Amino acid sequence: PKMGCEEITRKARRVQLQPTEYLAQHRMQVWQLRFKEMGPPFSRVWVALGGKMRRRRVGRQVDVKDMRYYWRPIEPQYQRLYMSRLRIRDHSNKLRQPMRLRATNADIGSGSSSIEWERASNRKYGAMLAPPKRQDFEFRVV
Amino acid sequence: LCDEQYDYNKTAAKQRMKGPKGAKNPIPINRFNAYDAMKHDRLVITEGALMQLEDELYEHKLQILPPHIRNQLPEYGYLDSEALGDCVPSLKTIQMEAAARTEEAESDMYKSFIDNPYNPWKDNMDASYAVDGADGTVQKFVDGKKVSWSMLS
Amino acid sequence: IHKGWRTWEYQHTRPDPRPFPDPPVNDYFGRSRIWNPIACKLGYVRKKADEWGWPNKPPPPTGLRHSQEFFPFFFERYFPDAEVRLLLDSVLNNETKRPVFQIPCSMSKVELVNYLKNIYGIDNVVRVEVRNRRGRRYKNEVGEIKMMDDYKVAVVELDTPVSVELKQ
Amino acid sequence: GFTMKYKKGTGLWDEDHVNDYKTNRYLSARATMRWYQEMERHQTRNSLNARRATQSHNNNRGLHHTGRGAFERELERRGVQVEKYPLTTTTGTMRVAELVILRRMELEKRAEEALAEQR
Amino acid sequence: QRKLPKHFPVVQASDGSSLLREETIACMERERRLPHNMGKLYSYHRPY
Amino acid sequence: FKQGQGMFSHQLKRLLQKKSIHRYNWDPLPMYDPRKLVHASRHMDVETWREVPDPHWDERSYLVPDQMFYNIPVPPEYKDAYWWRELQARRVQCPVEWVSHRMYNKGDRQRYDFQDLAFRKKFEFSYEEVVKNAKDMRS
RNA sequence: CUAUAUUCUUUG
RNA sequence: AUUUUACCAAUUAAGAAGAAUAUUAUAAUAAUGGGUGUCUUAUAUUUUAAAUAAAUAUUUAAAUUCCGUGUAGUAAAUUUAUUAUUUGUAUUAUUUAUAUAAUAGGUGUAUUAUAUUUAAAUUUUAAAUUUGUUGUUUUAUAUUUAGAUACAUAUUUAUAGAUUAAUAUAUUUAAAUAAUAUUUUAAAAUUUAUUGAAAAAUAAAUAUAGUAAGAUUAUUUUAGUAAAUAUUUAUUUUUCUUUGUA
Ligand SMILES: NC(=O)c1ccc[n+]([C@@H]2O[C@H](COP(=O)([O-])OP(=O)(O)OC[C@H]3O[C@@H](n4cnc5c(N)ncnc54)[C@H](O)[C@@H]3O)[C@@H](O)[C@H]2O)c1
Ligand SMILES: [Mg+2]
Ligand SMILES: [Mg+2]
Numbered sequence A: 001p002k003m004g005c006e007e008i009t010r011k012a013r014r015v016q017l018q019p020t021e022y023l024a025q026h027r028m029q030v031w032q033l034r035f036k037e038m039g040p041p042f043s044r045v046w047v048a049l050g051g052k053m054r055r056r057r058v059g060r061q062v063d064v065k066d067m068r069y070y071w072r073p074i075e076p077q078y079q080r081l082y083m084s085r086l087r088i089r090d091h092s093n094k095l096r097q098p099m100r101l102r103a104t105n106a107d108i109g110s111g112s113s114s115i116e117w118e119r120a121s122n123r124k125y126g127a128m129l130a131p132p133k134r135q136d137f138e139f140r141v142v
Numbered sequence B: 001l002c003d004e005q006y007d008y009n010k011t012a013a014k015q016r017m018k019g020p021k022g023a024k025n026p027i028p029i030n031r032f033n034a035y036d037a038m039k040h041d042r043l044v045i046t047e048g049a050l051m052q053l054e055d056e057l058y059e060h061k062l063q064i065l066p067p068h069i070r071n072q073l074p075e076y077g078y079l080d081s082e083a084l085g086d087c088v089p090s091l092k093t094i095q096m097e098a099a100a101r102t103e104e105a106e107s108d109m110y111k112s113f114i115d116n117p118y119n120p121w122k123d124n125m126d127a128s129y130a131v132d133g134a135d136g137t138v139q140k141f142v143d144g145k146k147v148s149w150s151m152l153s
Numbered sequence C: 001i002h003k004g005w006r007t008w009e010y011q012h013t014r015p016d017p018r019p020f021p022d023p024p025v026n027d028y029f030g031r032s033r034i035w036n037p038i039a040c041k042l043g044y045v046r047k048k049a050d051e052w053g054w055p056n057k058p059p060p061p062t063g064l065r066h067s068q069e070f071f072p073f074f075f076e077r078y079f080p081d082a083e084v085r086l087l088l089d090s091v092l093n094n095e096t097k098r099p100v101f102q103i104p105c106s107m108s109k110v111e112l113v114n115y116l117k118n119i120y121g122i123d124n125v126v127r128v129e130v131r132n133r134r135g136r137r138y139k140n141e142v143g144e145i146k147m148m149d150d151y152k153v154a155v156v157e158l159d160t161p162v163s164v165e166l167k168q
Numbered sequence D: 001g002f003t004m005k006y007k008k009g010t011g012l013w014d015e016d017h018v019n020d021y022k023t024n025r026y027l028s029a030r031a032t033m034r035w036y037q038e039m040e041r042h043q044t045r046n047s048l049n050a051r052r053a054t055q056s057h058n059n060n061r062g063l064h065h066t067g068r069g070a071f072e073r074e075l076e077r078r079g080v081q082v083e084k085y086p087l088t089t090t091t092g093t094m095r096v097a098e099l100v101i102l103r104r105m106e107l108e109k110r111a112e113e114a115l116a117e118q119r
Numbered sequence E: 001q002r003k004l005p006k007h008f009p010v011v012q013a014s015d016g017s018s019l020l021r022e023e024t025i026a027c028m029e030r031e032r033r034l035p036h037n038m039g040k041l042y043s044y045h046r047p048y
Numbered sequence F: 001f002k003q004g005q006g007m008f009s010h011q012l013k014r015l016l017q018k019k020s021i022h023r024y025n026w027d028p029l030p031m032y033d034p035r036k037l038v039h040a041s042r043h044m045d046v047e048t049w050r051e052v053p054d055p056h057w058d059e060r061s062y063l064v065p066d067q068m069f070y071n072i073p074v075p076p077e078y079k080d081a082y083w084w085r086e087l088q089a090r091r092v093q094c095p096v097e098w099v100s101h102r103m104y105n106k107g108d109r110q111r112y113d114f115q116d117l118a119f120r121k122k123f124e125f126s127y128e129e130v131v132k133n134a135k136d137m138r139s
Numbered sequence G: 001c002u003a004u005a006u007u008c009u010u011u012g
Numbered sequence H: 001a002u003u004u005u006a007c008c009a010a011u012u013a014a015g016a017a018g019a020a021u022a023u024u025a026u027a028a029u030a031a032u033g034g035g036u037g038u039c040u041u042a043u044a045u046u047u048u049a050a051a052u053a054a055a056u057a058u059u060u061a062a063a064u065u066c067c068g069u070g071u072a073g074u075a076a077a078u079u080u081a082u083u084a085u086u087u088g089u090a091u092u093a094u095u096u097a098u099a100u101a102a103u104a105g106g107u108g109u110a111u112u113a114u115a116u117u118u119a120a121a122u123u124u125u126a127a128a129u130u131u132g133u134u135g136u137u138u139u140a141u142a143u144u145u146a147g148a149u150a151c152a153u154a155u156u157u158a159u160a161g162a163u164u165a166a167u168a169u170a171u172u173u174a175a176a177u178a179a180u181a182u183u184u185u186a187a188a189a190u191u192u193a194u195u196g197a198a199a200a201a202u203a204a205a206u207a208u209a210g211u212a213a214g215a216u217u218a219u220u221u222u223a224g225u226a227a228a229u230a231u232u233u234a235u236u237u238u239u240c241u242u243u244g245u246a
């Protein structure tokens, strides 16, 4: 489940297709506020600023204070650790490359450039990232 | 050839889809393939089929060529086009000759209409354009008359 | 609903209730069998097919339906149906004053006497004793339980002793 | 939802743009006929239903089965062409085909004698 | 095309009138209880 | 008692499963009796002291449905108390759960009438009709 | 982390 | 003679209407609650109410308790839509049964160790668990059968960005554009809806369980031991020999 079963011969439940997660689910914005990734293809740092700052500034020294204003690469473990959440969209697709922090223009256009979207004149050539159309001078949502 | 295969559940979206997961437009069974070629030994091809194959694969093979070669195609007479009318039209199938004569027949209803597909935008090079400052719009004018159409919502 | 179940993974179909209902038909062919008082649609609809054609024919005026002339009453008055049958072992070669009849259960003691008077011409009947015996149940060789129709045993007491002789 | 309604008849033949996931490798002599039955009844069922639904719906809205109202009813009385683009009718689209065919047959006489003249 | 499933019994007159169908059904049923033809039963559970 | 090894309690578990006859008895109106409103608002003819059979009465009249009468004529001004059994007559005559299947599939939303819960087939063409209706338009 | 600091500087 | 010592052995082809209108998915045309062995009567046969549901939806952006929340008409009645017992065993695939038994009169020993016949020699039940790595605990009578899911692969039409907090800026080389999955069995619990007595029972869910746990299916193999280890992969950096470094 066997041709004898009183279990299966009386219908109970029927399981449906299960919905998939948001394709971008794992690019969480708490990363996108803190860091930014910089790099040439196949080598890219994520860089951040330092916190020692907003508790005690005074009395310490100016050098140790302004060692805080530099962009710095995150430690590689943390970078691998955060990148790993971006690598889980395709396992066993070895020929792929991980998702970036901020969506590039190719990654915006890829969702309208398919052959399943070509009749959708909404969301073509990017829409939701442009400012909205001026509404009819009598336009009202009531 | 084959039609492009579209997937309208590529994410999960429609749940009451029974289906498989994947292309929702699989190649139908009466096409030519490797399996049924390997099973049956003699391949019997009618000349209509030959002509149709060559016809649908022509542009395909032309695009593949390196660009210093594609430039010589018009010089060699490969690219002579019936639409432009440098040659007499070519041999087509029955159905395509039917469609073609259909358009030959229906080309006369678009003459006096400004949306004529066979002569669109004939009014460009006598046209004036005027930028409105009260609300951003650029409106077309011919003979002081506003030709351009403000869109509806 | 402190916590919502995952209901989005089920397609919509009603599961069978686990204390599953048994089928309404009565399988017990024994002594203690109960007639079911509950009336389904099919009873009334089959009535309606029986009395007048319900699907096709238009219904007769109520005055007819509720009158003696209405067909199932008409046909019952002028074409009665009863199997009033006799156990022979009561009337065989012994002289017996009390023959024993099998009777449809819807007959009274009076209706039997009327039956025997007007049809069989049996004009002396002191009285009738009545039993209701559940029909005879038997299994055949496949084990199909079958029950012959219910009957009424009437001991019918006469004035003159009656025998039916067997020539040996 | 969005199942791509616009691609339904787009295909050159009757059997494409149809999701056919019930199938086999080898199709027998009558399974093939079954396939050719299924496809054309898939087109015909879906077309005749879409005819019936709208004809019935137009009839329930009190107008002509075409969706052609009283106004357009008046225009046809007065001999006015009622629409902008008079697309080819059924009889026309049959006529094209047969004239093409009747060209091709004649040509296949002439070619026959041509080739027999050479050979 | 059939107007009743193949496995339904035919209960009707030869004319096709359904006038008597309940009598016919009743008859068939009392007949399935105790067939008139029926020979000696070989069962140990016997009506008498 | 339904719990036992006895056969009476064996029947009662089964016999009690069949479904009783259902009709929709739509509620009585004891205090507004529509059938006595025929005698409302009628002029008297004073010779015979019977009612005057006014021909204007029967076009202003509002027909109040019920089960054991066909319809009951009522003067219009009094129609407003009968608003519920106008909605019970137009209703489908069952629990809506029995007929609910008309609702869920798409083809039966378009072909069936849902106004104040009357599930009833709209007018719908046969196939030959559809064919000859689409044929004489040459489409 | 939230508030007060709003120029290259500053609080809990 | 009254009597031929004691001990020592298996593994079976199956005799047959005792397996088919068979199991599962598949049919986008019917459908007021199926009830036969049924059958007056309805004062006693009423289920309705703008909400996520027997109606179940084609992207990765922006924004929001910063950290589980996200894609908008595709054509306007247009063809994703709740189908079904025969006008093909309906078609296509898929799965399938523990009724049934002559089997052989003796090869090793005969004063105690345990299969290989020349005698001897040699032998602690495996798994999991323990990391002071066991002396502890749990499972296993046997035969047969059921039993658990990360895509080891990308051939011509064809094209790929860095940067600022921001506005901006522009010296400056790649690319096989697809996503759908993620062990397994188990608490004490919770929540919802009924019944009963003066919390219990019945019916629904896939709650969580590295200090509770237990299982996890294919031998004859071919590189070692933050820091380690593992997978894929990289550098011929100088001496007399030698060196796994990344
Ligand atoms: N986003 C848009 O608004 C949008 C998008 C694509 C194309 N268009 C085109 O813009 C033009 C007008 O748009 P709108 O929204 O202002 O009006 P509309 O298209 O909403 O309405 C136009 C009216 O004129 C009819 N019409 C359209 N094309 C016609 C034609 N070619 N010949 C005769 N009648 C025709 C329309 O069917 C309708 O009756 C049309 O070509 C429309 O298809 C507009
Ligand atoms: Mg239907
Ligand atoms: Mg057997």
Ligand SMILES: [Mg+2]
Residues within 6 Å of the ligand: H139
């Ligand atoms: Mg044990």
Ligand SMILES: [Mg+2]
Residues within 6 Å of the ligand: H145
């Ligand atoms: Mg096994």
